């Protein structure tokens, strides 16, 4: 829960930022998948007039 | 370990034991006394024979 670290910018900051970006992108993609599934299963279906 | 080592112990010696608050104490007083007996009694025939 404490990914926050920092020292020796040149490469450490680059790699840490790349990995944090991958992490947040993965979390956002999974949240998008969950929200799509929710909107899909909660969408009411037509039955008849 | 044994139940006979616990029936001879009034609940006065439980809430003083750590990690014994509300849920644990309620579970203990429920699952132990619902079988007819109770927690805290005076008996001398223990343990026969171990």
């Amino acid at each position: 829960r404490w990914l926050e670290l920092g020292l020796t910018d040149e490469e450490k900051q680059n790699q840490l930022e790349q990995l944090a970006e991958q992490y947040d992108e993965l979390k956002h993609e999974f949240e998008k998948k969950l929200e799509a599934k929710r909107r899909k299963i909660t969408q009411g279906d037509d039955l008849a007039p | 370990h044994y139940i006979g080592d616990l029936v001879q112990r009034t609940e006065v010696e439980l809430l003083k034991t750590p990690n014994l608050g509300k849920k644990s104490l309620t579970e203990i007083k429920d699952v132990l006394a619902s079988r007819g007996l109770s927690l805290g009694m005076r008996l001398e025939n223990w343990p026969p024979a171990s």
């Binding site: - | 609940e11 006065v12 809430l15 509300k22 309620t26 006394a33 619902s34 109770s38 927690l39």
Partner: protein, 164 residues
């Protein structure tokens, strides 16, 4: 939900004949009986539905006595050092919270006990307001006759009994 509770307390016919406070007391009794019928063990529970500020929150009454039968509602008169009692009697706990008060059996027992409580309260009220006139001649039509007693109506659903 609690919005349904407010709709119920506001959709009563005899509003002042049974005010919000005693309405919510009857509902507390309803939820207590419901929680009693939920668990196989017998345990007294107060609700305190929080008439206007918030929702309900069940509790766990102890009924402090030196007995141990069903220790869910048993605690000695001296257990006061830990769990912050510091008393001799009346020590009750607030362990279990947020029961369910809208399922089938809960709704059934609620409706039944509410009917009972409202009819009892209204009968006692219509009798008590006439109690101040004890020892006076009153009018009123009879309602029903029988071989043991008869019923009389003094107006505004005032039920009176006249024995044989």
């Amino acid at each position: 939900m609690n919005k349904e509770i407010l709709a119920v307390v506001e959709a009563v016919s005899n509003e002042k004949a049974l005010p919000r406070e005693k309405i919510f007391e009857a509902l507390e009794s309803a939820l207590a009986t419901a929680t009693k019928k939920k668990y196989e063990q017998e345990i007294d529970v107060r609700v305190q539905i929080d008439r206007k500020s918030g929702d309900f929150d069940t509790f766990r009454r102890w009924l402090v006595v030196d007995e141990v039968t069903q220790p869910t509602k048993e605690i000695t008169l001296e257990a006061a050092r830990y769990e912050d009692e510091s008393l001799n009697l009346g020590d009750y706990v607030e362990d279990q919270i947020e029961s369910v008060t809208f399922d089938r059996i809960t709704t059934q027992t609620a409706k039944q006990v509410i009917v009972q409580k409202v009819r009892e309260a209204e009968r006692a009220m219509v009798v008590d307001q006439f109690r101040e006139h004890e020892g006076e001649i009153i009018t009123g039509v009879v309602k029903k006759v029988n071989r043991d007693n008869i019923s009389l109506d003094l107006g505004n659903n005032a039920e009176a009994v006249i024995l044989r």
